[PDB]
Every structure is written in structure tokens, then in C-alpha cells.
């Protein structure tokens, strides 16, 4: 009953659009990450940003077209199913 104010309102996101995911894995052998993307049969950008000072953590950059919010979430969930990943950033 009742409703919250319009403050802290989540902004309108225009789908479809390229969404950016940050994937930190402890391997340079990125297969599963691209595999989960390729199943959508859509193109995607695979980038390497930087690696920790011990070369232990590899920061990967993924950017793909999401047609809706459900994809945006499910894909992010697949990113955590790699196991190689130590930290997923789904901002």
C-alpha cells in the first residue's frame, strides 16, 4: 500500500544497446567467457585492460548488444559461471 517518491529514480536505458561488463579472471585463456557470448550468435567486443602487479588478476573488458534487461542480467550470471573469474563488475 502506498508508493515511494520519484527520488532516486532509476534512469531510462535505451535497449537495444551495447552494455559494458568488467570480467577479472586469473587466466589469459578466455574461452568460456567468449563461448557464453557466442551462443547468442551476436557480435561482441573482447578487450584486455590491465593485469595486477603480480600478473595474478587479468582485467578483461566485454561489450555486447543487449536487446533487453533480462539478457543484461543472464549474461552477467554466465560471467560468474566461468570460475576463472574472481570478481565480476556488473554496473
Query: In the numeric block, which cell numbers belong to residue 75?
Result: 549474461
Experimental method: NMR
Residue 89: closest CA among 23, 34, 25, 27 = 23
* DSSP sequence for the chain: -----STTPPPP--SSEEEEEEEEES-S---HHHHHHHTTT--EEEEEEEE-TTS--EEEEEEEEESSHHHHHHHHHHHTTSSSEEEEE--
Gap between the Cα atoms of 76 and 91, Å rounded: 10
Q: Residue 4, preceding bond cis, omega within 30 degrees?
A: no
User: Count of residues for the chain?
Assistant: 91
- Which CATH architecture is the domain 17-91 placed in? 2-Layer Sandwich (3.30)
Ranges of each domain in the chain: 17-91
Amino acid at each position: 500500500q502506498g508508493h515511494m517518491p520519484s527520488d532516486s529514480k532509476k534512469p531510462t536505458i535505451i535497449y537495444p544497446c551495447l552494455w559494458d561488463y568488467r570480467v577479472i579472471m586469473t587466466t589469459k585463456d578466455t574461452s568460456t567467457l567468449k563461448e557464453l557470448l557466442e551462443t547468442y550468435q551476436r557480435p561482441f567486443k573482447l578487450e584486455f585492460k590491465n593485469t595486477s602487479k603480480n600478473a595474478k588478476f587479468y582485467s578483461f573488458n566485454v561489450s555486447m548488444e543487449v536487446s533487453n534487461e533480462s539478457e543484461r542480467n543472464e549474461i552477467f550470471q554466465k560471467i560468474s559461471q566461468l570460475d576463472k573469474v574472481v570478481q565480476t563488475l556488473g554496473s
